[PDB]
């Protein structure tokens, strides 16, 4: 009915600087008789329920610090965080409550903008316990890097692996604003014994060139 679109999809702001998020509605939500926009902004920190920040486009809810501010009218609205703080890292949603059904915008993740930090790369061959059980899992670990975009590719005897690895990433770290990442390559035991070199190739803005971490099977590590 009324659709909402937010911009950007994700946003990185230095400490103490300004974050701006935009909401565009398919249809005006200005109720003319009382001259109020029926638009709200919510904040959702990781693993907590959403919290109302602003209602009627520009009215702060109780307890909401002055650095949050809402503006705009009709179909264009803006949430502004004036002096971004550590606590403000979260996903921010807009929502129209002009008419049922209510609709949310897609959401905007707001992360701390840090300086570039290159990953520390570590690699772990399978344990003998697991190998006795029929499966081999190699783990590559990228530690404390920024930004979060990093490319991790498995090469087994220099052949590029597809569809047999899974990667996972931590939330932004409260103390240093970095990320960590694990890639796990799982093979059958038979397939693991068929090959020698197991290499993890890591690309990241903070590395002047691709970093490889490698080991040979059954040759210590």
């Amino acid at each position: 009915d009324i659709q909402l679109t937010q911009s950007p999809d994700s946003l990185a702001v230095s400490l103490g600087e300004r974050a701006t998020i935009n909401c565009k509605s398919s249809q005006s939500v200005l109720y003319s008789s009382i001259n109020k926009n029926y638009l709200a902004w919510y904040q959702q920190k990781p693993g907590q329920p959403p919290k109302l920040l602003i209602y009627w486009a520009s009215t702060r809810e109780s307890g909401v610090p002055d650095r949050f501010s809402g503006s705009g009218s009709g179909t264009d609205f803006t949430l502004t965080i004036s002096s971004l703080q550590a606590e403000d890292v979260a996903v921010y949603y807009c929502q129209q409550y002009y008419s049922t059904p209510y609709t949310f915008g897609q959401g905007t993740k707001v992360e701390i903008k840090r300086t570039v930090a290159a990953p520390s790369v570590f690699i772990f061959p399978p344990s003998d316990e697991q190998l006795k059980s029929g499966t081999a899992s190699v783990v590559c670990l990228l530690n404390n890097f920024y930004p979060r975009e990093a490319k991790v590719q498995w090469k087994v005897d220099n052949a590029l692996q597809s569809g047999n690895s899974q990667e996972s990433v931590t939330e932004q770290d409260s103390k240093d604003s970095t990320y960590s990442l694990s890639s796990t390559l799982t093979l059958s035991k038979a397939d693991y014994e068929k090959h020698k070199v197991y290499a993890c190739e890591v690309t990241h803005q903070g590395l002047s060139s691709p970093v490889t971490k490698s080991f040979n099977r059954g040759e210590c590590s």
Binding site: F122, I123, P125, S127, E129, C220, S221
Partner: peptide, 9 residues
């Protein structure tokens, strides 16, 4: 399963 420390970590 353990992910053991080695020279590669």
């Amino acid at each position: 399963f353990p992910l053991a420390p080695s020279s590669k970590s």
